[PDB]
Structure formats: structure tokens, C-alpha cells
Nucleic acid binder design. Structure first.
Lengths: 148, 148
DNA sequence: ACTACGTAGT
DNA sequence: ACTACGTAGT
């Protein structure tokens, strides 16, 4: 479990499978969009996220990404998302200011996008009355650009 | 889709993931235990099976393997297995006498076991009143032995 | 749409 | 036990 850059993995590197992300220490979960670990202390912090067509993420070709919290049956019946696990880790990552690897799903299937910081999160009341989290992430300046 | 030996894959070769079986043309399905294809004609025939702790397969260290049909919620509520798809392909493979690759799940995760022929199948009435298929497969003589 | 002898992590 | 922004094939 490593925070920040992973040796031998360059911005722009592409992968066919989630399991390659795991083999290379980029992103461990087989399906989950958020990976996290405990820091110096009991607190969870996020290490990497995957945005691949789930959940109405907002990805333009700018430095800012809006990333939807996991769960609540968003993207069984609708229910409130919960500030635990990966959602809570992303939140905590706001205070820690730790880098977070971002992998983006591409319609060969995944690209490493570089490091981002989580700048804030908020709650939204979906079209169903249920809570959804949104995390605003900003790419750290100085990284190679990606074409899209 | 190839019947029989796959170039560069030796009896005794091991693999961590089902997806490596697929990449190498050993076994295509991501989860399904039976892979099949159409032959000269409209008929399905089996090309490979995976025995990995599902379904009460009978695997001793002999040349004969008893392989359970798929479905029926065996290994939702219990229901009759059906002679279609992979089950039907294995059955048809009795008449075709075509080789069938056998991969065995090992408690790094999978081993290629060599080629077998399907010699017969039968039906069994499980402890639930529902039908289950059993296929008897016999390893073709002349192949390297595996330790167990 | 839907079946599937998958997987990792907590 | 249970969650999960997986997958391939038909």
C-alpha cells in the first residue's frame, strides 16, 4: 500500500484490467472505485480512485474532477450514501492533503491519470430524496498532459 | 477457439487467474466452468472445463474425473439442470470424441491438466428432487503425469 | 438480458 | 458476511 507515485508507472500508461492495477500496486480492489489505507493514527486516507462510467462523475479535460461517492445503490432500491470506508477516506484526504492516484476508464480499458488532491466534498439530495456525496479533486500541476 | 492442445501451454503449467486462461486461449469464459464452440454443423462441442471446488466434482489422482453439470443453482432455490449450452456441448462431445482441455483449481490457483475425452453422462436426482448431470471424463494416455 | 466452478478487501 | 465505478460469452 503506497501513497503517491508508483515506481515504473507513468502518467498515460494504459491497462486492460482492474487486476493489472492491483498487481502493480496502483489500485487494489477488484471492483471498488476507492482504495484507502490507515495512516499514522487510526484515520483512513485515500490512495487511489477509479472513474470509469459509474456514478455520474464529472470529468472534463480540465484539472478538476468531480467524483461521486460510492454506495447508496447509485449508478435494489435507492438509499443514503454513508460517510464510511472509501467515502470517509476520501473526505479525510482533504485534511491530510495527500496525493491520490486517479485512474480513468476508457471506452485499452484504463489509463493512469496522475496525482490529485481532494479539495472538498459536499452532499447532494438526489432525485430520490437520498444523500449522495461529491468529492472535488484537482490535479497537481507539473504532470504530463493527457489527450482527449 | 481451438480444440485440443494449445501451442506453448504445457501440462502442469499454472495460472493465478481465469483471465490468463482466456488470454492464452485455454478457457474463455470469465466464470463459467464449461467452454464450447460450434463444429462443422450446427452442433455444440466442448473445448475445455474448469474444476475448482464448485459442484461436488469427483477428482481422484486417477485418469477418470466425474464432472458436475452447471446450473440448477447447485454449488436462489434448487431447480433442474438443463441440457443446453455447456451441458449440451459436453454431452455432444461424447459422440464427437474430441479432446477437451481440463483445468483444475488448486487451493498458483489453476493448473492445466491435459486432454480428456467425455465417455458418458447420466442424470442424478439430488437430495432436493432436482436433476443434476454428471459427465465421466477420461484422460488420454501418453501425457505427462501431475503430482498430488 | 442474463448466466457464470470470479476476486480483493474489510 | 458482505460490498464492490468487474468481465466474457451467448
Amino acid at each position: 500500500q503506497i501513497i503517491g507515485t508508483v515506481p515504473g508507472v507513468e502518467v498515460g500508461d494504459e491497462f486492460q484490467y482492474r487486476m493489472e492495477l492491483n498487481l502493480l500496486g496502483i489500485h487494489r480492489p477488484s471492483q471498488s472505485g476507492i482504495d484507502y489505507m490507515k495512516d499514522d493514527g487510526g484515520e483512513l486516507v485515500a490512495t487511489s480512485i477509479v472513474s470509469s462510467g459509474g456514478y455520474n462523475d464529472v470529468l472534463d479535460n480540465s484539472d478538476v474532477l468531480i467524483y461521486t461517492g460510492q454506495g447508496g445503490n447509485v449508478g435494489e432500491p435507492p438509499k443514503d450514501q454513508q460517510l464510511v470506508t472509501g467515502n470517509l477516506a476520501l473526505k479525510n484526504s482533504i485534511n491530510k492533503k495527500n496525493p491520490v492516484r486517479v485512474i480513468r476508464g476508457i471506452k485499452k480499458n484504463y489509463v493512469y491519470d496522475g496525482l490529485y488532491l481532494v479539495e472538498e466534498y459536499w452532499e447532494e439530495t438526489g432525485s430520490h430524496g437520498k444523500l449522495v456525496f461529491k468529492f472535488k479533486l484537482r490535479r497537481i500541476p507539473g504532470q504530463p498532459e493527457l489527450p482527449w
